[PDB]
Structure formats: C-alpha cells, structure tokens
C-alpha cells in the first residue's frame, strides 16, 4: 500500500465537480477547486487547472494528473515547512504517509496547528498522540477517515486500510 492508494481510498474519485464534506467545490481525487459559492467560480478554476474548457467535467487521466501534482505539492510543502519537516524526518515510512494524508486534506497550515500532537509524534508517544489528535474538529467532522489516519500513526501499519 502507498500514499496514492491510501489517498484514493480516503478521497474517492469523481469526474464531475462535486461538493466536499465542507461544501466546497472539488473534482477528481480530492482536488479542491475553490471555497467560493459559485459553481461558476469553480468551473473557471477548473479550466485554468486543466488548460481546456471542461464544462465541469474531466477524464480519469486529468484526475490522475491533478492527483500527482497535489501529492507532490503536499510532500514539498511538508519539507519546506519548519514545523512539519522535523516531524516528517523523525518518522518511519508508514507514519510518514499518515502525515502526508493530513496535509493533503487540511493543508500545511492546518496540520501545523496541531502543535501538541506533532510533539508527541516526534517523541514517538503513539498512544498519547492518537488520543490527542481525536480532540479536534477534524476528528468530529470526518470521524471514519480521521480514525483510519490516527490508527496509522498509532500502529505504524496499514491495518486500517486493509479492510477497504
């Protein structure tokens, strides 16, 4: 299992603009287009993103290209961030995927605000960090996905995804 399969599981694939759990306009594999309420603002961002007139629709290939770019940007963002980089460097390969997943979802800025959990992670206090991470709007709003990630950090294995 790898970052791409993990994220494909968590986010799904949609080839028509859709609204995410927060109501924002998204397409493909969790690619946020705009936080704006306008389907029209969304459609324009989409065309910009793809380089064609899509009329709100894209192919699987386009979805995949967007996904590649996004995972790439997620990783680079962590590596450039002073708060995240050290955590990332301290982790094993599987737990590294869990942090990439969080950043893909909530952006660098948001994960960076999980100060305390980040500390526990760096310290390798698995159990404590899992408990602390559950105390978030994140866990309350997307509990099953948050549970999957948390289990991933807790255990260092892909068990939470082996099912799915």
Swiss-Prot record:
Induction line: Expressed late in the viral replication.
Keywords recorded for this protein, A-Z: Antimicrobial, Bacteriolytic enzyme, Cytolysis, Glycosidase, Host cell lysis by virus, Host cytoplasm, Hydrolase, Viral release from host cell
Enzyme Commission number(s): 3.2.1.17
GO cellular component: host cell cytoplasm
Domain of life per record: Viruses
Recorded family membership: Belongs to the glycosyl hydrolase 24 family.
Entry annotated with the keyword Hydrolase: yes
Subcellular location: Host cytoplasm
Annotated function: Endolysin with lysozyme activity that degrades host peptidoglycans and participates with the holin and spanin proteins in the sequential events which lead to the programmed host cell lysis releasing the mature viral particles. Once the holin has permeabilized the host cell membrane, the endolysin can reach the periplasm and break down the peptidoglycan layer.
Protein name per Swiss-Prot or TrEMBL: Endolysin
Annotated effect of mutating residue 20 to E/Q: Loss of 99% of enzymatic activity
Catalytic function, reaction form: Hydrolysis of (1->4)-beta-linkages between N-acetylmuramic acid and N-acetyl-D-glucosamine residues in a peptidoglycan and between N-acetyl-D-glucosamine residues in chitodextrins
Cited PANTHER family: T4-TYPE LYSOZYME 1-RELATED
Gene name of the record: E
Active site residues of this protein: 11 (proton donor/acceptor), 20 (proton donor/acceptor)
Protein source organism: Enterobacteria phage T4
Entry-linked SUPFAM superfamilies: Lysozyme-like
pH dependence comment: Optimum pH is 7.3.
Any GO BP annotation: defense response to bacterium
Pfam families hit by this protein: Phage_lysozyme (PF00959)
Residues given in the record as substrate binding sites: 32, 104, 117, 132
One MF term in the entry's GO annotations: lysozyme activity
């Amino acid at each position: 299992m790898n970052i791409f399969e993990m994220l494909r599981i968590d986010e799904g694939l949609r080839l028509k603009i859709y609204k995410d759990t927060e109501g924002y306009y998204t397409i493909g594999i969790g690619h946020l287009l705009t936080k704006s309420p306008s389907l029209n603002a969304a459609k324009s961002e989409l065309d910009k993103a793809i380089g064609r007139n899509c009329n709100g629709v894209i192919t699987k290939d386009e979805a995949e290209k967007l996904f590649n770019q996004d995972v790439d940007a997620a990783v680079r963002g962590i590596l450039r961030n002073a708060k995240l980089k050290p955590v990332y460097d301290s982790l094993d390969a599987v737990r590294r995927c869990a942090l990439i997943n969080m950043v893909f979802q909530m952006g660098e800025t948001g994960v960076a605000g999980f100060t305390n959990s980040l500390e526990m992670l760096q310290q390798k206090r698995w159990d404590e960090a899992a408990v602390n991470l559950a105390k978030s709007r994140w866990y309350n709003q997307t509990p099953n996905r948050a549970k999957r990630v948390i289990t991933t950090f807790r255990t260092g294995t892909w068990d939470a995804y082996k099912n799915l």
